[PDB]
């Protein structure tokens, strides 16, 4: 689940159209819900909410805003990995 989020987060920073940003966020969201099932759970409601915020911008046709709005997702995701590896 974390490997899907990180791999597709490079696609957003590389894609240059609303067709590939929306598609990448769809896989990123599908894993975010999947990872949540397995405070830690409340840490994903913020992340999925930020995917909705980025996916809504990329749906309106603003690819440039989506890549700018997906940067804030990188810090939140990196915090969960640091918090999870400490717990395990």
């Amino acid at each position, epitope marked *: 689940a974390f490997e899907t989020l990180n791999d597709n987060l490079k696609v957003i920073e590389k894609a240059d159209n609303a067709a590939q940003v929306k598609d990448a966020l*769809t896989k990123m*969201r599908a894993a975010a819900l999947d990872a949540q099932k397995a405070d830690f759970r409340h840490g994903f*409601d913020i992340l*999925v909410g930020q995917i909705d915020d980025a996916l809504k911008l990329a749906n309106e046709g603003k690819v440039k805003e989506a890549q700018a709005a997906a940067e804030q997702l990188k810090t939140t995701l990196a915090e969960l990995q640091k918090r999870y590896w400490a717990r395990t």
Partner: antibody, heavy 124, light 108 residues
Framework: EVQLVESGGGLVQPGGSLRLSCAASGFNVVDFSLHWVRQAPGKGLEWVAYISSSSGSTSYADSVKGRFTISADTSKNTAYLQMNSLRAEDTAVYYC?????????????????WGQGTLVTVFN | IQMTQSPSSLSASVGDRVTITCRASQSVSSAVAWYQQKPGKAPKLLIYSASSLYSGVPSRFSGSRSGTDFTLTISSLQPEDFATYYCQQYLYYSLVTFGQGTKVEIKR
């Protein structure tokens, strides 16, 4: 009791305009996005359009974008679907769905409550 | 995405067990729902999140998931369970695609 009722379906000339309204009772539209799904007579369900009145977003199916224009009215607690340039493939029964807001359980509920459905037929 | 549902028409007598298979085109995590459309009426939700039972339906309905392959299993049919069952995925608000549709018929 939560219920949704539609109106406005009826005979329309091809290329004409028809307006479908989904009067919502027992809840507030601001707390639940309203979706429209149509069923061609004797076929499977298909998605049409949705409006999230809290955020103002709106999307349409690939086969309908550019013709339909869905709007919501919180004061009257209804959601209107304006249909323009109807063709022969738009004859169906249009259901008005409901769907919770992420996050939490209500998002997982999917289309828990459905409308009665109004028949829209294009006629020569 | 695309959602294939089989069998498209099956027959089973009262008291028999029915398995309906739905297979997504790509991974949809656990976003699958099953509806039951009686002839001439609006569909009703039966299973949501692909495994949970919606409150208000008899307990005989059950769901399952194996990777990207889903299944709706009826433990024991009754004369009130003869209708069309549709398989839906709801991965995102704008990517909703329904299955073809399985119809259950009386066997004689």
């Amino acid at each position: 009791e939560v219920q949704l009722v539609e109106s406005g379906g009826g005979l329309v000339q091809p290329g004409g305009s028809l307006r479908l309204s989904c009067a919502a009772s027992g809840f507030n539209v601001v707390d639940f996005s309203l979706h429209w799904v149509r069923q061609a007579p004797g076929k499977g369900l298909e998605w049409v359009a949705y409006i999230s009145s809290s955020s103002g977003s709106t999307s349409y199916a690939d086969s309908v974008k550019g013709r339909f224009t869905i709007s919501a009215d919180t004061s009257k607690n209804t959601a209107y679907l304006q249909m323009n340039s109807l063709r022969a493939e738009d004859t169906a029964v249009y259901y008005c769905a409901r769907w919770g807001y992420w996050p939490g359980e209500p998002w997982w509920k999917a289309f828990d409550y459905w409308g009665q459905g109004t028949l829209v037929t294009v006629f020569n | 995405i695309q959602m294939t549902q089989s069998p498209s028409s099956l027959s089973a007598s009262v008291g028999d067990r029915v398995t309906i298979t739905c297979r997504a085109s790509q991974s949809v995590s656990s976003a699958v729902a099953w509806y039951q459309q009686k002839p001439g009426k609006a569909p009703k939700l039966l299973i949501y999140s692909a495994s949970s039972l919606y409150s208000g339906v008899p307990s005989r309905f059950s769901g399952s998931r194996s990777g990207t392959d889903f299944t709706l299993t009826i433990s024991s049919l009754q004369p009130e369970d003869f209708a069309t069952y549709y398989c839906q995925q709801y991965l995102y608000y704008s990517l909703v695609t329904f299955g073809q549709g399985t119809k259950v018929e009386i066997k004689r």
